[PDB]
Design an enzyme around this catalytic site. Structure first.
Site, mmCIF file in Angstrom:
data_model
loop_
_atom_site.group_PDB
_atom_site.id
_atom_site.type_symbol
_atom_site.label_atom_id
_atom_site.label_comp_id
_atom_site.label_asym_id
_atom_site.label_seq_id
_atom_site.Cartn_x
_atom_site.Cartn_y
_atom_site.Cartn_z
ATOM 1 N N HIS A 41 0.804 -1.206 0.000
ATOM 2 C CA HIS A 41 0.000 0.000 0.000
ATOM 3 C C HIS A 41 0.852 1.278 0.000
ATOM 4 C CE1 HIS A 41 0.429 1.028 4.272
ATOM 5 N NE2 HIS A 41 0.090 -0.205 4.596
ATOM 6 N N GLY A 143 2.822 6.153 9.892
ATOM 7 C CA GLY A 143 4.168 5.980 9.382
ATOM 8 C C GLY A 143 4.946 4.833 10.002
ATOM 9 N N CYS A 145 3.972 1.746 9.373
ATOM 10 C CA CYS A 145 3.759 0.674 8.399
ATOM 11 C C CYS A 145 5.081 0.165 7.820
ATOM 12 C CB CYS A 145 2.852 1.149 7.269
ATOM 13 S SG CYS A 145 1.111 1.332 7.768
#
EC number: 3.4.19.12
Lengths: 301, 301
Positions: A41, A143, A145
């Site tokens: 993503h 952030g 991820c």
């Protein structure tokens, strides 16, 4: 003596964290040999996340659209591919700090360390369990991820988890390092049900054994019980069923303390049925389930 | 979102851990520039620990009596000295992995990370608080002596703690990196009293602010209270007195949540007077006091 929720030393993983940017989105990646792994993503806008067609969105991207930064160094991307829900960016240099590593897919109820990262830089380390419903209760701000979970066997790092998303319920979901989600989740910003979560019974028992080794014995009872009798109590209290495989894994701890597993189940039963009456075990007022039998043995040894 | 007891990434400290042996005793040392720091009781036998005369025992030792091993490397000792309760072994090579570092003496109620080590090799990392009575509730098995506590400011490592001993009560005591014990303790195997330990009030309040930010608001009350009224309640429950310095440190968190500190004290008062009625806050059934206001701000940011 004493008992703390301990994480693995994070150094071997720190040297692998990088920053990946595609368009406007920046998150963490894992640089091992000449591949960088990150959540796919990264290629989505916030609008894309409603209903992304990852193949179509990936088509619009070429190697030079992926910015991979390791500290101040810039890596050169010579290939990209999507493996399930992870992007694999082939780069031109091997990470000199690549430890011995494996990719493992862990089972629900097992534990691992997380290095929580923001823009490719580490911020903190903590120890957690994969819940029976394949979520984790983590600390993941915007952030994070692409931050990874791992175990360490002396010198080998076993990567088991990559963070992908926060569910609307506040719990976290992610993948193994082959990009297969743990649990039923998808990388789409839609309502997603986690199952009923259950307590990891074998871990609670392991922790009770930890408590005895450390001097807390008040919960020890005159009673014993049976596997079927106990599981009746477990089902009622949303504890996962205890099997003979679990009883066996607890064997070393039973040997060390001289307490049979079923005796300890009977203590747990009374705990479950009567609560703790405002007392504590190992400094906790709740029954703790994020130490495995292996965790307890390793910390005591 | 979400809230975990997070330790600093341990990599910068891992590269400094060494093994020190004098006679039969082996423990952990910290190798920075061309000095190795370890607990002076490395020079004691188990019989010596009853009543050691450290100066006399150190006299029997010369540079070649101290074995310093860094991984498989052997370091050469060209000088030794005792600074308070730490030995400083001057070696012939600088540690190439020496990070930017400082030695700091922290205050009771402040938090730090511990890298727990055995024979100069790291085993786990956890986050803890220095208790108001200058003990720590750690995880220190035989041979963890010389493991260190630290904080990290982006790239600088601030060493604040070296583990020395377990008290007969099971809690742990140690020194700053200049060898001055925290609290009244001595490096002697004798009965030693820790004071009454109190709960770190400003940390509990910080954690309550963390809970609100994360969606737990049930404990929020209609009441407010005064600093003197609250401290009456604190003294009763063995909470440390709240001062205006504490109220001020909580300022940013009050700003973020729109809850005045005294409103939050009134919630805490009711919590203290009424208990939790079997409910939880941030997954805990007890009031947590090992997050500072700075910890909460950094994790949310």
């Amino acid at each position: 003596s004493g008992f703390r929720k301990m994480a693995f030393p994070s150094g071997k993983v720190e040297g692998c964290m990088v920053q990946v940017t595609c368009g406007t989105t920046t998150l963490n990646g894992l640089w091992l040999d000449d591949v960088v792994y990150c959540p796919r993503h990264v290629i989505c806008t916030s609008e894309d996340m409603l209903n992304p067609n990852y193949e179509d969105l990936l088509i619009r991207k070429s190697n030079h659209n992926f910015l991979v930064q390791a500290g101040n160094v810039q890596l050169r991307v010579i290939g990209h591919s999507m493996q399930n829900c992870v992007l694999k960016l082939k780069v031109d240099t091997a990470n000199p700090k690549t430890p011995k590593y494996k990719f493992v897919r862990i089972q629900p109820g097992q534990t691992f360390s997380v290095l929580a990262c923001y823009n490719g830089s580490p911020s903190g380390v903590y120890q957690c369990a994969m819940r029976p419903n394949f979520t984790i209760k983590g600390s993941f701000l915007n952030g994070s991820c692409g931050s990874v979970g791992f175990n360490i066997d002396y010198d080998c790092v076993s990567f088991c988890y990559m963070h992908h998303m926060e569910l609307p319920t506040g719990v976290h979901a992610g993948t193994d390092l082959e990009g297969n989600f743990y649990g039923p989740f998808v990388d789409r910003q839609t309502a997603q049900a986690a199952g009923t979560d259950t307590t990891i019974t074998v871990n609670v028992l392991a922790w009770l054994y930890a408590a005895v080794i450390n001097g807390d014995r008040w919960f020890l009872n005159r009673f014993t019980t049976t596997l079927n009798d106990f599981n009746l109590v477990a089902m009622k209290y949303n504890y996962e069923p205890l099997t003979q495989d679990h009883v066996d894994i607890l064997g070393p701890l039973s040997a060390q303390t001289g307490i049979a597993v079923l005796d300890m189940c009977a203590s747990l039963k009374e705990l479950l049925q009567n609560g703790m009456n405002g007392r504590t075990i190992l400094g906790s007022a709740l029954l703790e389930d994020e130490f495995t039998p292996f965790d307890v043995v390793r910390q005591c040894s």
